[PDB]
Scaffold this active site. Structure first.
Site, PDB file in Angstrom:
ATOM      1  N   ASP A   1     -24.637 -14.485 -16.154  1.00 40.72           N
ATOM      2  CA  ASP A   1     -24.235 -14.495 -17.576  1.00 40.72           C
ATOM      3  C   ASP A   1     -25.007 -13.408 -18.257  1.00 40.72           C
ATOM      4  O   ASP A   1     -26.266 -13.500 -18.343  1.00 40.72           O
ATOM      5  CB  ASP A   1     -24.562 -15.891 -18.181  1.00 40.72           C
ATOM      6  CG  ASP A   1     -24.259 -15.995 -19.683  1.00 40.72           C
ATOM      7  OD1 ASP A   1     -24.033 -14.936 -20.358  1.00 40.72           O
ATOM      8  OD2 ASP A   1     -24.219 -17.177 -20.161  1.00 40.72           O
TER       9      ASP A   1
ATOM     10  N   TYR B   1     -21.686 -29.986 -20.982  1.00 39.48           N
ATOM     11  CA  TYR B   1     -22.410 -28.724 -21.068  1.00 39.48           C
ATOM     12  C   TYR B   1     -22.407 -28.202 -22.484  1.00 39.48           C
ATOM     13  O   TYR B   1     -23.470 -27.828 -23.000  1.00 39.48           O
ATOM     14  CB  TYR B   1     -21.671 -27.763 -20.091  1.00 39.48           C
ATOM     15  CG  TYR B   1     -22.191 -26.325 -20.088  1.00 39.48           C
ATOM     16  CD1 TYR B   1     -23.369 -26.050 -19.406  1.00 39.48           C
ATOM     17  CD2 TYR B   1     -21.457 -25.298 -20.718  1.00 39.48           C
ATOM     18  CE1 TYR B   1     -23.840 -24.695 -19.388  1.00 39.48           C
ATOM     19  CE2 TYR B   1     -21.899 -23.948 -20.741  1.00 39.48           C
ATOM     20  CZ  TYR B   1     -23.062 -23.670 -20.022  1.00 39.48           C
ATOM     21  OH  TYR B   1     -23.562 -22.359 -19.969  1.00 39.48           O
TER      22      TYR B   1
HETATM   23  C1  LIG Z   1     -25.695 -17.924 -22.255  1.00 37.42           C
HETATM   24  C2  LIG Z   1     -24.668 -18.208 -23.352  1.00 37.42           C
HETATM   25  C3  LIG Z   1     -24.706 -19.718 -23.706  1.00 37.42           C
HETATM   26  C4  LIG Z   1     -24.300 -20.410 -22.426  1.00 37.42           C
HETATM   27  C5  LIG Z   1     -22.953 -19.880 -21.862  1.00 37.42           C
HETATM   28  O1  LIG Z   1     -22.449 -20.662 -21.146  1.00 37.42           O
HETATM   29  C6  LIG Z   1     -22.511 -18.489 -21.842  1.00 37.42           C
HETATM   30  C7  LIG Z   1     -23.252 -17.761 -22.796  1.00 37.42           C
HETATM   31  C8  LIG Z   1     -22.858 -16.338 -23.016  1.00 37.42           C
HETATM   32  C9  LIG Z   1     -23.101 -15.967 -24.435  1.00 37.42           C
HETATM   33  C10 LIG Z   1     -24.574 -15.965 -24.619  1.00 37.42           C
HETATM   34  C11 LIG Z   1     -25.069 -17.409 -24.580  1.00 37.42           C
HETATM   35  C12 LIG Z   1     -26.589 -17.434 -24.809  1.00 37.42           C
HETATM   36  C13 LIG Z   1     -26.880 -16.901 -26.210  1.00 37.42           C
HETATM   37  C14 LIG Z   1     -26.427 -15.462 -26.152  1.00 37.42           C
HETATM   38  C15 LIG Z   1     -27.128 -14.730 -24.991  1.00 37.42           C
HETATM   39  C16 LIG Z   1     -26.654 -14.606 -27.386  1.00 37.42           C
HETATM   40  O2  LIG Z   1     -27.571 -14.741 -28.212  1.00 37.42           O
HETATM   41  C17 LIG Z   1     -25.577 -13.519 -27.371  1.00 37.42           C
HETATM   42  C18 LIG Z   1     -24.707 -13.895 -26.136  1.00 37.42           C
HETATM   43  C19 LIG Z   1     -24.937 -15.406 -25.993  1.00 37.42           C
END
Ligand SMILES: C[C@]12CCC(=O)C=C1CC[C@@H]1[C@@H]2CC[C@]2(C)C(=O)CC[C@@H]12
Ligand SMILES: C[C@]12CCC(=O)C=C1CC[C@@H]1[C@@H]2CC[C@]2(C)C(=O)CC[C@@H]12
Lengths: 125, 125
Positions: free
Chosen positions: B38, B14
């Site tokens: 999320d 992942y």
């Molecule tokens: C979805 C994600 C990646 C996959 C993961 O497994 C958990 C996260 C949480 C942090 C997310 C990120 C996506 C990119 C995000 C939205 C930003 O630009 C700020 C917060 C960050």
């Protein structure tokens, strides 16, 4: 009433109380009908007296407990990475779990779960 | 069929697939009726097409993703600490969540939850 500041301080109180063997300090963090599941996969312990007995048994050896990263806290949940170290018959063990707490709106912990497997238990022979 | 080795490798697949922007690689890890929440506290996304749209939106900026501790994996669950870094309009941000996966006995992820709050989003002005 609950906030990420409060839940982060509760995690810090919990770690310190395990270090101090302050079995009361730990139990006061929990709601009266809270559950503890440690490890994830095992039978949950439910209610104050069962939660106290769990911790009293957890604390027969002195534990050295330390958070190893920042706490993650949002909404009414927190998760944290940390180690619990102990020595027995001259073997040092370091266990590295991730725990999760869920809180009620009174700021008490309604459920803990501790996630660690055999590859998270670090010990020499 | 599921094991802690398998779930740890799925976490590693992942993380690598988020680095590669391999949106397919990510979705194949999930069961067909899986959910993604999320962040923790937000509305779960449910099923393959919703999970893909979530990740496609997550991946509009290049992400640098790295595990920062060992994975914890036991029973049919895993949790992991890691960072997701990106740059936009010349501000670098590092987000540090803890994620949790639950697996079915086929070894596919049936639910992810990502726990991070505002104090886990690290960025200069
Ligand atoms: C979805 C994600 C990646 C996959 C993961 O497994 C958990 C996260 C949480 C942090 C997310 C990120 C996506 C990119 C995000 C939205 C930003 O630009 C700020 C917060 C960050
Ligand atoms: C209960 C506990 C501390 C409180 C905590 O919050 C999560 C853990 C899991 C690791 C446990 C430890 C209790 C002491 C244990 C049982 C050992 O002697 C080996 C595993 C370790």
């Amino acid at each position: 009433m609950n906030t990420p500041e409060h839940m982060t301080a509760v995690v810090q109180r919990y770690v310190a109380a395990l270090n101090a063997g302050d079995l009361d300090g730990i139990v006061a963090l929990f709601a009266d009908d809270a559950t503890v599941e440690d490890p994830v996969g095992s039978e949950p312990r439910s209610g104050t007296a069962a939660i106290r007995e769990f911790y009293a048994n957890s604390l027969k050896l002195p534990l050295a407990v330390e958070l190893t990263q920042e706490v993650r806290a949002v909404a009414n949940e927190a998760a944290f990475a940390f180690t619990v170290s102990f020595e027995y018959q001259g073997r040092k063990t370091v266990v590295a779990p991730i725990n999760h707490f869920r809180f009620n709106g009174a700021g008490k912990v309604v459920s803990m779960r501790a996630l660690f497997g055999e590859k998270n238990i670090h010990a020499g022979a």
